[model samples]
Target: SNAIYGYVEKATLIDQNLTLSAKLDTGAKSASLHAVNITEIEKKGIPYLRFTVPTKTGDYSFEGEYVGKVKIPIKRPVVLLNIKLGDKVRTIKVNLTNRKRFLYPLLLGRDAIIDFNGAVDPALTFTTK
Candidate 1:
C-alpha cells in the first residue's frame, strides 16, 4: 500500500467537525492535543473529561472518555478521540495539555502515524488535501 505522506496536515476532529493543523511526529509515542480547563467528571458512573480546545476558529468544548494519564516528565490526561487525516478516520489515544506556546494545536505521534499508514516527508505540508 502507498503511504499517506505528510509532515504537517489539516485534520478534523470527526465528532466536532473542528479542523486544525496537526504535526505528524514519528519520534513521539502518543498523540497530543491543546486543551484547557480540563475537568474530570462522572457520567452514569463512568469517568469522563470535559475540556475546551482553542482554535483559530474558536474555542470548542468536548467530553471524552477518560482513558488514563501519561508522564511526559509531567503527568497529563489522556483521552480517546476520532481524528480524520486525509480520508481515514482513526480513534487514537491523545494526551491533553496546554499547548498555547506551540504553533500547531494538534500533534500526531507514532500511534496515529502507524494507524494511518503514514510517511512523513519533512518538506511536505497538507499533503492529504
Candidate 2:
C-alpha cells in the first residue's frame, strides 16, 4: 500500500471532539502529548492517571490507565490514547509532559507513523485534510 505522508496534520481525540495540530517527528520513537497537572490515582488496585490537556480555546481533563514512564532526561508518564489521524483511528502510546514551550500540542512519533503506514514530507502541512 502507498504510505500516507504529511509533515503536520490535524489530529482529533477519539470521542472528545477535540482537534489539535500534531507534528510528525520521524526521529521520535514514541508519541508525546502536552499535558499538565498529572496525578496518579488507583482504582481496583490498578493505577490510573489524571491529567489536564490545555489548548488554545480551553482546557480539557482526562484520565487513563497508567502504563509506565518514558525518560527523556526527565521521566514522564505514558498512557494509551485513541487519536484520529487522517481517516484512521488508533490507540497509541503517548507520553504526557508539559510542552508549553513547543508550538504543537501533539508530537506523532515513528511508532504512530508506522502504525498508520505513514511517511513525512517535510514540505507539506495538514496533508491529511
Candidate 3:
C-alpha cells in the first residue's frame, strides 16, 4: 500500500541501533508528498513541520534505488521529494502544510539544521550512507 520516493534510491529502513539512513536525490520537482502513502504507516498530522510522502513528477512506478542527494532548494517556495519505482515514476502522494517544521509528523526543519540534531536528512541533504 506504500511506495518509495523516486529520488530516494538506496535507503535502508533502519541503520545501526534504529538509526534510519534514508537518502533521496529528489532529481525533480513534486517529489515530496504526504508521508502516509510512502511509509504506508499512516499519519495523524504534524503539529508544526510539513509532512508528505511525495510522488514522482510524471506519475509512474519508481525503481526504489539510491539516486543521490536532492537539494532542499531554497529558490523554490515548496519542498520536493522523489521516489524511484519503474521508469523512474510511480511515487506516493502530497499532503503539505504551511506550518513548516512544526506541522507535525515532522516537527524539525531549518531548526534541525541550525541545531544540527533531529533533522539530519532533508536539511542536511542526506543521500549516501
Candidate 4:
C-alpha cells in the first residue's frame, strides 16, 4: 500500500533541482507544470521542448525532448521528469503547459501517482486537520 497523500503537497523536480507546491489531482490523467513561452523545436525530425518556469528567485529555462503524449481530449506535450513527492521519488512522464493563472505551480495527476502507490485522501488538507 502507498502512503496517503493530500490533494496538495510539496513536490520536487530532481533534474531541475526545483521544489514547489503541487496539487495531487486525482481527476487528471497527466501531470503538468506552470510554464510560459512554450515553443517546439526539432532535432533530426524529433520534437523538443523549450519553456520557462518561474522559481521563487526568478524564472528558469528548461529544454527537453518530447517523450510522448499519453492522454485524450486534451493532448499536451509530455516529457520525462524525476519527481519527488513526500518520501517517494518517481520518474514520470509529464506534460508542460502554461498554468500561470492557476494557484499551484505544479499538478501531479494519476499517471505520476499510480506507480508510487499513491492514494488520495480527499477529506484531508495540507495539515490534515
Highest lDDT against the true fold, candidate: 1
- Models 1 onward score TM values of 0.93, 0.93, 0.18, 0.79
Q: Which stretches of candidate 1 lie over 4 Å from their true place?
A: none
Compared with the true structure, what per-residue lDDT tens digits does model 4 show for residues 17-64? 788878889898888887777788898998878877887789877777
lDDT of 3 at 61: 21
- Ranked candidates (TM-score, high to low): 1, 2, 4, 3
RMSD over all Cα atoms, model 1: 1.3
- Model 2 misplaced stretches (Cα beyond 4 Å): none
lDDT of 1: 0.89
lDDT of 3 by residue, 1-129 (tens): 122222223321111111222334333323232232222221354212232333333222212222233334432223222322222222232223233232222222332122222223344333332
Say which candidate scores most in TM-score.
1
lDDT comparison, 1 vs 4, better candidate: 1
Candidate 4: RMSD to truth: 3.1
Question: How large is the C-alpha RMSD of every model relative to the true structure?
Answer: 1.3, 1.3, 14.9, 3.1
Supply the global lDDT for candidate 4. Answer: 0.77
Q: What is the lDDT of residue 37 in candidate 2?
A: 92
Arrange candidates, best lDDT first.
1, 2, 4, 3
